[PDB]
């Protein structure tokens, strides 16, 4: 139903305005990358290890907000086929502070590895071209761990460690960018993970804000991503905690 | 029109789900307060000054998301009269990490002052009661600079300084929590302010995320807050930056 597609996508509008237009969003991005630099500079690794930083791409280093804008304007729920065309369009922007942090790490005895669920087979060329254009250093193909068979990222983190690196910090917009322990889990478990790691945030786990999509969306309800549009609308509305209007 | 009120409020749903339900939101709050503690501990003030921290309340230390939930469920645009009832309902929650940071500052040779646009005359009693209940220390009336005649906050910051304090850092969710220079201005000027202060974020300006409301909403269009509901909907949709769907 067109009506349902419209309602689902309209629900993203205010958060999209915030991400695209606000100075507040920029300030949060700068806050994250300023904290990340401090953590990188303080980091020490085991003898014989090289220093690695793991960075997510989408909504962490790369800004894909125009794709979300297209979804709103065309009443289009997420579809991987549309996403692949967006990547191929080579119009990604950089998240504020990301390029500077990336290039600083790479020029100060570190290496940033991009662990991302952009697809290795169909989305790599656009990703690399955009990152070169946006000014990122160190975007040779071997710096990338794009998605092959698994969306969970822990195995790719382990690959990096096997190459003689110690990962000193992780940057992401999704808790699944920090490991697998709440991958595919609902939001109660995801909040619990955050509470159990409270002291790591802004130190070894660096967060960027993303009010538009993520593991928290699936986290709204069991089997969310398999529900139809009406089901996803209902899941969102049922998750709302509301004042009853009484004293 | 009921239809317009519905559309305007539905546009907040996804960002509200994110703020209310996600672990990611909690992680951003912990990141902010972890960074704030580091900045406080590092701060030095002029001889003879006392150390102050200025903190915003709404969506910085206090969580009012159930009011937003009520707006969504009842198709209610913001109204100060409803807000006053919400405050009186004494159901505010605490932003994660805020109480711990607040109490740490107050027990380590600092003082937190609450500079907030909750209203001094009608909203003070509920604010103080909620903060006591939530575990904040140092919530005697003199710690508060609630709104009297002006929403811009710089004059209240100056009052604090006149009492012999040097403000070592500011915590907020709205750029207007850091001064007056972009108060009432559109988002281009607000983004420019952030760029001009890039290095301060996560150090002396501590940001909390708020995708639901703020100076950035008014910042979407000249005279936004005076437009009718249809006008505000149009302003939001016109602000959207969208991919054209082409390569
Ligand atoms: Mg991402
Ligand atoms: Mg506030």
Curated annotation (Swiss-Prot), chains A, B:
It holds the Pfam family Acid_phosphat_B. One of its GO terms (cellular component) is cell outer membrane. It is a lipid-anchor. InterPro entries: Acid_phosphat_B-like (IPR005519), HAD-like_sf (IPR036412), HAD_sf (IPR023214), Lipo_e_P4 (IPR006423). Keywords: Cell outer membrane, Lipoprotein, Membrane, Palmitate, Signal. CDD domains: HAD_CAP. The keyword RNA-binding does not apply. It is found in: Cell outer membrane. Its main location: membrane. PROSITE patterns: PROKAR_LIPOPROTEIN. This is Lipoprotein E.
């Amino acid at each position: 139903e067109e009506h349902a597609n419209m309602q689902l996508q309209q629900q993203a509008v205010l958060g999209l305005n915030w991400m695209q237009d606000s100075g507040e969003y920029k300030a949060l991005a700068y806050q994250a990358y300023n904290a990340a630099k401090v953590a990188f500079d303080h980091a020490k690794v085991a003898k014989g290890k090289k220093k690695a930083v793991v960075a997510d791409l989408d909504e962490t280093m790369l800004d894909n907000s125009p794709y979300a804008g297209w979804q709103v304007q065309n009443n289009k729920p997420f579809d991987g086929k549309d996403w692949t065309r967006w990547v191929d369009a080579r119009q990604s922007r950089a998240v504020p502070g990301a390029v500077e942090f990336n290039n600083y790490v790479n020029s100060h005895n570190g290496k940033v590895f991009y662990v991302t669920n952009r697809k290795d087979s169909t989305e790599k060329s656009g990703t690399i071209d955009d990152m070169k254009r946006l000014g990122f250093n160190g975007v040779e193909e071997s710096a990338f761990y794009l998605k092959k068979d698994k969306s969970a990222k822990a195995a790719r983190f382990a690959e990096i460690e096997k190459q003689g690196y110690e990962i000193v910090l992780y940057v992401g917009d999704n808790l699944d960018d920090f490991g697998n322990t709440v991958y595919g889990k609902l939001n109660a478990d995801r909040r619990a993970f955050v509470d159990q790691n409270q002291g790591k945030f802004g130190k070894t786990f660096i967060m960027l804000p993303n009010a538009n999509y993520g593991g928290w969306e699936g986290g709204l309800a069991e089997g969310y991503f398999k529900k139809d549009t009406q089901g996803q609308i209902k899941a969102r509305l049922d998750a709302v905690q509301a004042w009853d209007g009484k004293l």
